[PDB]
Assembly symmetry: D2
């Protein structure tokens, strides 16, 4: 069919208002078509495209594909976390970020290592519905708060998928509007699509009970997905995680080139008081976003979710017998993460997840690989906080 | 043999095999950090780093499908990344044409989220058929927000008052401006918290994002302030008052980097046939999702559907700092009725803190330069310093608006 | 004339004489030179009003204008209910004019709403909003949630320990034990679902319960201390750092009150016919919507508001609160409100309006509601004191009335701004 | 003796007789038969107290309990300064007990701070904080900025035109034209640099200026209207949607007031020797710091607070505001405060404390400061009315007193939270 034609001929056919057998040649043709519309057609010459596996990308991850964008991947490690060691991949183009995180890791290792805990777990979706009157939306809120109402909604939600297991609902009214926050674990997937499908069936079951209910939007921004929101900071979203470590005074001096007292003075007055003066919600840290973003790009995550996933409060305190040691913790209530689906279906992304031992589904305990990866992120963020904060104090 | 191979390093490393260098590290003849300088070529430094790393992993074959060969590590080494074991391919798709200020743009988007490019492209089509979009840059200046301490809050009050006088601001401006060509200090903004004093330095930065530049100007500026006030302590050159890579109302209100607005009118027929919904439905969803819903969620600056998706994809493609998506995605999306019978859709996106550049950082790498070249904004603009960065900022905001149109249409049609 | 301090103290210590036998000057002499500090004047001097008079005379000597208190009234006020309950070092009272806005037509009833203010035009403006609602068929309201909160901060040795405590509180058995201890402290103390938040080794625990018709702070605080005492039995290394760790949150702006509610969460609504908007409010439905969106939503959003998506709910909350013996400082959270306005009816020319206020902190028993003047204003509304046959119904009704009066005030001021003066 | 309606009406319409020649019962007879509208009572009745009396009588017969107003007082109060200035449809006044905390040792002076509250122990607790400050060698304060704001929203045809108007206001020549129009309205008006914000075709414009010793709302609003009139001459397509588009921001929580200031921005501080912390506050510096960090910074942070990094600033702000004739609804923003506690001295055993309050909205002229009782409390502090020679000094001084009294309250409540019980 298309194999017996040439490159010039197939371009002539689509131009004339009128399929291809190999994925890489389809990319090549799309690149040549695009060149015709650019002022500099030679601009694509150093954008690569050759010998990348487009089979896993077409239809699943990307459209109108013209190549790929290489992001340098460095390793910060070993990170000593919950009695294990992790070599953490970090895809970035910011100078010194991987070296600085690496120093944070070294400080943590010498201090006995870090311990972390996952405090909560459940991706959310927050549709907006409308009723004729505020008295009607109030009725629906009351009904969703009975055990009988919650049970029928749970049955409908949980029918859509193996890992669909609905947790306590959260609701807010604004006149005749009602926002409904559905939360559920989702195996090792980040869970956006799963929870959305569950939410649609739950909302259709709710329609049966309340026929005058309009479903205005399956996402009414009450989730909240990929925008700053106090609701994510307070209620959590995805994995809520806490990590901690004590850095001996000697290590703060030799490795970090500062003191425990100076580190505490900067953290309080930068990460708490300064974030406070700037009007931050959830941004009580130095640069958690750098680490989250770098790990996310390396590990096939949705990097747009660094908006909520980077929420972090970094606290530093005096510790030990002489009160000269550095206690540090990071608390990240809304880490949106997964080891199956999305960009984690791609082979290079899986290489980075494999380094950490979290690639794919955990067959023995659904959701444990994603939980582990969240812990690693929170741990690596803490390393980053240590090093950069030390650089600022000194 | 161990000690024979050590003598060959002293003369060089090219005359030893991979295995002999690795054996030299494992037995402690040579420390692992000394491989950076000794090994000549960059790709063989990456290869030996990988092989050393692989034997430490629970799965030795983990890095099999992580590519590393035939990539330009020369630009990456000592500038963009360290402990490099390879690189991560992010698919690039193209959305366009985007009809913006009488130009057409083919917008590159680096993402792994399915249908994002296709959806954004459909937004672009509704905009093209509506007569195009128009944007303006409203403000420009990267910031840095150090925190200094004085012994008493009365002293910090003294310093703030001095910085607010015409005379004092002039002396600080001169020290700041001396560091760079583009460094031109705008009006200072300060907040006291007791004896803490937070000073927000703001300055244009040519076509660079400007973080490093404004930081150098800040250090020398605070050096001159130290002369007028010896008891002042420089606690941290960033005291989170910038604010960089964290959510902050100050960025939303004062702006950071490029503040931008974009707008378009989409005829009713284009809303029906291209977007598969009505103007009345789009407006009802925008109000109750992007305003009221974001309000009920306690959002500062997140009055949009999915601005972050587009900001992130363009940023990765175009060599930006993708972590700056935190502040750069700040956006309010507004929809209202338009035209004679209120049946046309007016849309605007306003994004007060797009942090962006076309020189420096990831924009120094060649694949990223290719994507910047597509848009006609690669490198520095010689005739008009800052114009390439301002143009990219306008493309981001316009592409965001096309994204909002498409996703909001899909939510309205349910 | 005043005799020496020694004789005066013997007359003071004598049971059959007391302070009644001493002069104002002699009382003032004993204070000036210790023996009596000043705060013991209340528990010594014959009458409350004389104690105030003495206090005013002492204060006046200290001031740079001795006649400063001349027009600060004090005589013939019922101080007996104020002493040891509502106020200390009392030198008098501050008259706040009270107007009446109504009838407020709400849930098929009519209310005459008292309002204590010094802002010109507030009561008349609110009365105009009431008239518009009344001619539109009236307002409807619903209490969506009810529970005063306290948000202590406790610390464990490590974050891992605080996580253990969070998880234990989340089990049915752990919560049951804590609920038992909380609920044992009072007949109204009925602990609802807990929300907790970790920050390192800190653990913030938000206790929520109804509290009859009382605002409930004192009662919830008592419940909380007993619950934390019980939690310490299971976790002996837990330090209670503060019974309030600002997680409640009380009298400070906080997203948590907006999102979770605090006290009473209420919604009110009404439809104003097109004609009524023109005749009473001197504007149009179309114009009110456009101002509401671009001021109360978009303007509030550009200013970086959490919970402040309204025009002047604070004006109404404060005036009703002062009038009705509420804690006026709680206007900070009680003012939280989103005001919404859209087109309604066959024509799509009628004005739908709603006010949602998630954190009205209110009560008809305790605190300032113990005083007779503020009880007269509660009596107007039919909500004074406890409702015996339905505990909490009076405070619920008062929250409904606040939300409804806020909506009246929203209608009127938004019409004024739309009509350009 | 009560006459028929028609006879009563001739007397009412007789210009040398009027309502004075009718009985209360006859005026009420006329009102119930719809001859006189109830709102017109104000200008028909001679004495204002009598107007209040008849309004109450009409009101009582509408209430579920007719005797509900018995203990709402009304007699012998000066309604002359209230009627058509501070309140409408007046049925009496509401006594709020006034207590006094002090001496507050602030900027080498001593203040006797008046506080109108119904919360038990607030005055005594604030008084204890004052004592700790006084024995610690005093507090020092500075007004860091000063200017009331108004934040109108205007609409242009397109976002491109709103952008044009913004750029025009930012030129030195365009600003000058606007500043001339603004400053022409009042001798105190001095327009500072303009802050602006776009949302599509909306433009929010934040006018800021001093206002003498007035709080300044009506003055700034007058100057805003004149300034936008001038702006309309250069951009006649501009539509002035609302003179307040919530960008001020007045009486709602808003990050803009926190970050930019509104009214007076003030900072206060003091060092409390360890000995005073022990004897007055019953605790240690170490314990107070740990509570302050984890409650007022971390707790407020976990609650998602903007500007509420304090314990009970609103308690003190509200009490002084009611006493001193301020607008108590402005406590919403005026309570914005960050309280910071730090170790000081050679063994880290003294307590550095500071409160920073960026948006104190305050005045000593106009509004409720026109009433005599409120003026008595202003006279107490030596700040009543206008400062002739140094305009603004009285309002500034009151703002410093509010910030310092807040710091006193923070000291005392935080010490009580730190010790326990
Ligand atoms: C690359 C890292 C992340 C870094 C470091 C750093 O970690 N230095 C120590 C080091 C370096 C190399 C090896 C070992 C140790 N210092 C800075 C820095 C700080 C202030 C300044 F003015 C300019 C540069 N940055 C960039 C921070 C930037 O990405 C977020 C920052 O703006 C967030 C904030 O703190 O506000
Ligand atoms: C990939 C895009 C961005 C997209 C679309 C989309 O644009 N669809 C129309 C279309 C598709 C294909 C070709 C042409 C046009 N619909 C959804 C979606 C919404 C709700 C739902 F339940 C599940 C999927 N998403 C994901 C949104 C997601 O990444 C941010 C979203 O969560 C932000 C929000 O609205 O809160
Ligand atoms: C006293 C009331 C509350 C009021 C009215 C009002 O309701 N007028 C109509 C009316 C009057 C009398 C009888 C019947 C109807 N107009 C204003 C006003 C607006 C803008 C302006 F520049 C200056 C005065 N205010 C003060 C608003 C003030 O307390 C919160 C306001 O600042 C909150 C905001 O909108 O941002
Ligand atoms: C009335 C004052 C302000 C006060 C005091 C107080 O100041 N005590 C020391 C004292 C007393 C008497 C004389 C001398 C010194 N303690 C409490 C209190 C704390 C925890 C508790 F569970 C219940 C009561 N409150 C009420 C605080 C309340 O109005 C805002 C508070 O809720 C704000 C907060 O901390 O979240």
């Amino acid at each position: 069919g298309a194999k017996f034609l040439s490159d010039a001929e197939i371009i002539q056919l689509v131009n004339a208002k009128h399929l291809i057998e190999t994925h890489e040649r389809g990319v090549s043709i799309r690149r040549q078509l695009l060149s015709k519309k650019l002022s500099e057609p030679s601009s694509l010459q150093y954008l690569p495209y050759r010998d990348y596996n487009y089979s896993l990308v077409m239809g699943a991850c990307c459209e109108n594909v013209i190549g790929y964008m290489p992001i340098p991947v460095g390793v910060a490690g070993p990170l000593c976390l919950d009695e294990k060691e992790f070599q953490v991949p970090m895809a970035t183009t910011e100078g010194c970020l991987v070296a600085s995180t690496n120093r944070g890791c070294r400080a943590i290792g010498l201090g006995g290592g870090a311990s972390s805990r996952v405090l909560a777990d459940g991706m959310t979706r927050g549709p907006v519905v409308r009723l004729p009157r505020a008295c009607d939306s109030a009725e629906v809120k009351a009904w969703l708060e009975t055990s009988e109402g919650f049970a029928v909604i749970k049955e409908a939600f949980d029918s859509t998928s193996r890992f669909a297991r609905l947790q306590k609902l959260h609701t807010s009214i604004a006149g005749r509007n009602l926002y409904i926050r559905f939360q559920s674990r989702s195996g090792d997937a980040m869970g956006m699509n799963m929870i959305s499908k569950g939410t649609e069936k739950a909302l259709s079951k709710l329609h049966e009970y309340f026929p005058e209910m309009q479903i205005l939007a399956v996402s009414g921004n009450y989730c909240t997905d990929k925008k700053p929101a106090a609701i994510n900071w307070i209620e959590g979203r995805g994995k809520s995680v806490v990590c901690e470590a004590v850095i001996p005074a000697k290590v703060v001096r030799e490795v970090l080139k500062t003191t425990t007292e100076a580190m505490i003075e900067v953290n309080i007055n930068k990460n708490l008081v300064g974030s406070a003066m700037a009007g931050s919600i959830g941004g009580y840290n130095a640069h958690a976003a750098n680490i989250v973003t770098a790990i996310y790009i390396a590990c096939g995550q949705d990097a747009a979710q660094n908006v909520g996933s980077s929420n972090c409060i970094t606290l530093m305190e005096a510790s030990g017998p002489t009160n000269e040691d550095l206690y540090i913790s990071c608390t990240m209530p809304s880490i949106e993460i997964g080891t199956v689906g999305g960009g984690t279906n791609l082979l290079p992304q899986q290489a980075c997840l494999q380094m950490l031992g979290v690639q794919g589904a955990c067959k023995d305990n659904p959701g444990e690989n994603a939980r582990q990866l969240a812990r690693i992120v929170c741990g690596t963020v803490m390393a980053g906080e240590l090093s950069l904060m030390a650089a600022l104090a000194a």
